[PDB]
Amino acid sequence: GAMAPSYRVKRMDIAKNDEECVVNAANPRGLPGDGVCKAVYKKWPESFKNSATPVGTAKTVMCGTYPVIHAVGPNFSNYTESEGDRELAAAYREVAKEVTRLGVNSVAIPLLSTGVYSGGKDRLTQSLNHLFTAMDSTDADVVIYCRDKEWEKKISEAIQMRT
Ligand SMILES: COc1ccc(C(=O)NCC(N)=O)cc1
Ligand SMILES: COc1ccc(C(=O)NCC(N)=O)cc1
Ligand SMILES: [Cl-]
């Protein structure tokens, strides 16, 4: 584990992370996709061998020795608010289990069920709170990667608020 487990946020490409493993904002089918998923495919294409996994789950595939944890958040276009919220919480709980199993001291993580899986709603607070609920009991350093200036500030404030 990290000596003093922390949360940090950066606004940059998660494919250029400085952590011991990465979480992909994957689709259920292991397709290259667009956005974060496509950046992850371009950087670690070998990690998309049998990466397909259902909504609300996480499936780790090695690229060399670098673990890619494919986490499938619900697409709120398709899910009800109630069912989508349940599946989004579940995906993050599966990420925490994989991060623990891998024995890593750090993980790069994007906010799941945002952007094209958001159903046209700002889900920063909903997604980040489910991330915290799952990761708080882990001792990995967590580095959250985002792609929005207003989000970077809010995530940073939310981290600093808990101390
Ligand atoms: C390729 O990774 C990234 C990483 C971050 C961004 C981003 O912050 N866009 C919004 C802005 N430029 O205000 C875009 C792409
Ligand atoms: C009002 O609807 C939305 C819908 C989606 C977003 C969103 O996820 N932004 C961050 C990103 N990285 O794409 C923000 C607002
Ligand atoms: Cl997404």
UniProtKB/Swiss-Prot annotation:
Changing residue 13 to A: Partial loss of ADP-ribose 1'' phosphate phosphatase activity. Signal peptide: none annotated. It is a peripheral membrane protein. It is found in: Host cytoplasmic vesicle membrane. ADP-D-ribose binds at residues 13, 27, 35, 115-117. Changing residue 117 to A: Partial loss of mono-ADP-ribosylhydrolase activity; complete loss of ADP-ribose 1'' phosphate phosphatase activity. Phosphorylated by host on serines and threonines. Residues 4-163 form the Macro domain. Interacts with mRNA-capping enzyme nsP1. Interacts (via C-terminus) with host G3BP1; this interaction inhibits the formation of host stress granules on viral mRNAs and the nsp3-G3BP1 complexes bind viral RNAs and probably orchestrate the assembly of viral replication complexes. Interacts (via C-terminus) with host G3BP2; this interaction inhibits the formation of host stress granules on viral mRNAs and the nsp3-G3BP2 complexes bind viral RNAs and probably orchestrate the assembly of viral replication complexes. Interacts (via C-terminus) with host NAP1L1. In the N-terminus, the macro domain displays a mono-ADP-ribosylhydrolase activity. The central part called, the alphavirus unique domain (AUD) has a zinc-binding function. The C-terminus region, also called hypervariable domain (HVD), is mainly disordered and binds several host proteins. This intrinsically disordered domain contains 2 SH3 domain-binding sites and 2 FGDF motifs necessary and sufficient for the formation of nsP3/G3BP complexes. Seems to be essential for minus-strand RNAs and subgenomic 26S mRNAs synthesis. Displays mono-ADP-ribosylhydrolase activity. ADP-ribosylation is a post-translational modification that controls various processes of the host cell and the virus probably needs to revert it for optimal viral replication. Binds proteins of G3BP family and sequesters them into the viral RNA replication complexes thereby inhibiting the formation of host stress granules on viral mRNAs. This is Non-structural protein 3.
